[PDB]
């Protein structure tokens, strides 16, 4: 087969009912995740290959970066609640990995302020129970798939992407293979 269970993807031994159709996990501390988002633009290219209106979900994880890592999971919940992911993803990645200026929860807040989210609005969302619920959803989704590494992509709660053996000598060819593979997995019956 051109797509083989155990090679380009794995079938979860314990599938997850009700899971998002396309579910990515990342950490702003995760170096491959910086490449995936800032250089390869994996999420955007998967989106362009799936039908218009499929739900893609992207969650942050707690198991990298200790205290600040868990602060970033709560900040990502704020980003999802306010719908400002496209404004803060680059400065959060660069603040953690490029300039390394994000060292406290206040430094995270500064990134939102600089991106145009008013301090009053960020603070209200940060302390809101809507955000607490999104934090819980992120933790539960990770536990549902027994998540131990990032970046990770899961399709229909049933399949995990395995990019590790794919040819990465050409970054556009690799991104296309990745997206075509997600599309194939989404179409499995």
Curated annotation (Swiss-Prot):
Protein family: Belongs to the thioredoxin family. DsbA subfamily.
Compartments reported by the entry: Periplasm
InterPro entries: DSBA-like_thioredoxin_dom, DsbA/DsbL, Thiol_disulfide_DsbA, Thioredoxin-like_sf, Thioredoxin_CS, Thioredoxin_domain
GO cellular component terms, semicolon-separated: periplasmic space
Disulfides per UniProt: 30-33
Gene: dsbA
Domain Thioredoxin: 1-131
Keyword Zinc on entry: no
Pfam family, one: DSBA
Organism from which the protein derives: Escherichia coli O157:H7
Keywords: Disulfide bond, Periplasm, Redox-active center, Signal
Chief location bin: periplasm
GO molecular function: disulfide oxidoreductase activity
Function: Required for disulfide bond formation in some periplasmic proteins such as PhoA or OmpA. Acts by transferring its disulfide bond to other proteins and is reduced in the process. DsbA is reoxidized by DsbB. It is required for pilus biogenesis.
Protein name: Thiol:disulfide interchange protein DsbA
């Amino acid at each position: 087969a051109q797509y083989e269970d155990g090679k380009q993807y794995t079938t979860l031994e314990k599938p997850v009912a009700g899971a998002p159709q396309v579910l990515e996990f990342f950490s702003f501390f995760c170096p491959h995740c910086y490449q995936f988002e800032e250089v390869l633009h994996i999420s955007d290219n998967v989106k362009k290959k799936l039908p218009e209106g499929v739900k893609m979900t992207k969650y942050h994880v707690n198991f990298m970066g200790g205290d600040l890592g868990k602060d970033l999971t709560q900040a990502w919940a704020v980003a999802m609640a306010l719908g400002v992911e496209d404004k803060v993803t680059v400065p959060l990645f660069e603040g953690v990995q490029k300039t390394q200026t994000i060292r406290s929860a206040s430094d995270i807040r500064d990134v939102f302020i600089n991106a145009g989210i008013k301090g009053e609005e960020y603070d209200a969302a940060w302390n809101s129970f809507v955000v607490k619920s999104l934090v819980a959803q992120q933790e539960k989704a990770a536990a549902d798939v027994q998540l131990r590494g990032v970046p990770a992509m899961f399709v229909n709660g049933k399949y995990q992407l395995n990019p590790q053996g794919m040819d990465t000598s050409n970054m556009d060819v690799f991104v296309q293979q990745y997206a075509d593979t997600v599309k194939y997995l989404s179409e499995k019956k």
